[PDB]
Amino acid sequence: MTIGRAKVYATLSKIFYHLFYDEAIPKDCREIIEKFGEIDFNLRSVLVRELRGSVLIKDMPQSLAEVYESVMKDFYERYGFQASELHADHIAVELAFMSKLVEREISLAQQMKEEELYKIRAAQHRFIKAHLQPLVKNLPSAPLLNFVRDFVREDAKYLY
Numbered sequence: 598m599t600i601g602r603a604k605v606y607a608t609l610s611k612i613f614y615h616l617f618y619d620e621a622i623p624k625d626c627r628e629i630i631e632k633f634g635e636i637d638f639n640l641r642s643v644l645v646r647e648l649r650g651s652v653l654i655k656d657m658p659q660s661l662a663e664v665y666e667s668v669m670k671d672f673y674e675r676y677g678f679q680a681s682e683l684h685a686d687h688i689a690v691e692l693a694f695m696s697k698l699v700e701r702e703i704s705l706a707q708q709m710k711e712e713e714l715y716k717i718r719a720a721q722h723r724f725i726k727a728h729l730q731p732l733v734k735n736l737p738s739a740p741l742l743n744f745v746r747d748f749v750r751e752d753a754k755y756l757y
Contacts, residue, residue, distance in 0.1 A: 655735065721756055722756040
């Protein structure tokens with residue numbers, strides 16, 4: 598289960614980072630995602646580069662929109678996470694942040710840090726509700742994007 602969650606987030610993050618670039622998806626990363634049924638990765642960097650919370654969330658008040666990246670960095674710095682070179686609100690970075698949290702969760706499951714385990718899962722849920730899900734609800738329709746949308750949606754249900 599946790600197995601699991603972390604593998605999917607890391608993979609999804611790497612894929613989007615490749616598409617930004619316009620790297621090809623190692624057929625190993627293909628393999629992981631295609632295990633969930635057949636989908637295609639036929640998206641161009643021109644689109645992908647713009648898949649950022651502050652671009653995609655249309656209802657976003659402009660005053661927030663011009664400080665949203667700074668808001669994202671705050672959440673990251675609080676959890677001892679640090680971005681790649683991409684904008685902090687880029688789907689690839691947000692997805693990467695989640696896999697950090699989920700992988701730290703494994704360690705905590707392995708040890709029996711119950712109290713820290715709850716706190717970490719609460720942080721994951723707060724991040725999804727506030728940032729990642731609003732981002733994914735707003736993706737255009739496409740097989741890979743739909744996959745991310747469903748995955749994040751069910752993960753939010755799971756974490757509650």
